[PDB]
């Protein structure tokens, strides 16, 4: 699959998301 999990800090809040590329 293609599940990584680039989780950032947005505003303050980490983010987590799953890289659709």
């Known amino acids: ?3 990584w ?3 950032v ?3 303050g809040v ?3 998301h799953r ?3």
Do not use: L
Request: proline share 0%.
């Open 1 to 3: 699959g293609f599940a």
């Open 19 to 21: 890289r659709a590329n």
């Open 5 to 7: 999990n680039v989780c």
């Open 14 to 16: 980490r983010v987590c």
């Open 9 to 11: 800090y947005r505003n």
